[PDB]
Amino acid sequence: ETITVSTPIKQIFPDDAFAETIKANLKKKSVTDAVTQNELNSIDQIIANNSDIKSVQGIQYLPNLKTLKLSNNKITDISALKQLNNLGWLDLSNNGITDISALKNLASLHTLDLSNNGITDISALKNLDNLHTLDLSNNGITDISALKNLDNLHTLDLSNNGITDISALKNLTSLHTLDLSNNGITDISALKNLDNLETLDLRNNGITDKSALKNLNNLK
């Protein structure tokens, strides 16, 4: 995905606010100034939180993008992230995201914050082997079996969902920080073998048997 003609920023990036961000990243004078693919290749980091962004259309032309933080905007469609192979840190928290299949092949992702969206299906996360830090709180997640081979996870927040079954966590032995609060969990035997947990929150579930926590030594 490249542009081949020098093109106004506002034409590539139609969202008012997102175009301003690109303009500022490239130190251009106006969103109507023309930019080249070469210039777009230079962009490796975009931070535009709290900015009323409605669309990231145009972002597909930023192949070297590594860090993208877009917390608290109005983003609903992220399909244009699909081929950004070099993304490492993605924060899309507080948006209106539902479908995340666009994340499916982002093999370099290591830090992902998707909290406070409308996500239900997370099977697109299943092959993101480099994830160590994942925040999925305040969504509508019920099935978490996509997490089961993400064994580089060390920090996981699954609070405020509709999760009932957590056997998917049983072999995530590198977990040290886990938030499971405000779900529908009843059985935590899956946590038995997470010997490196220091911080755990299980409040507001339907758990009665807590003997699995007795032998977790590094807990606070």
Side-chain angles (χ1 to χ4, degrees), residues 159 178-182 185 199-205 219:
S159 66
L178 182 58
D179 190 347
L180 291 172
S181 64
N182 277 289
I185 296 159
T199 307
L200 182 68
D201 194 349
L202 297 174
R203 282 168 306 172
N204 294 307
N205 279 283
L219 256 149

Side-chain angles (χ1 to χ4, degrees), residues 4 25 42 61 69 77 81 93 107 119 128 132 140-141 144 163 165 173 177 215:
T4 72
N25 205 290
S42 76
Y61 297 110
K69 302 183 186 191
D77 177 329
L81 306 189
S93 66
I119 294 166
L128 304 186
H132 59 57
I141 293 166
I144 60 167
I163 298 164
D165 189 299
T173 56
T177 302
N215 282 269

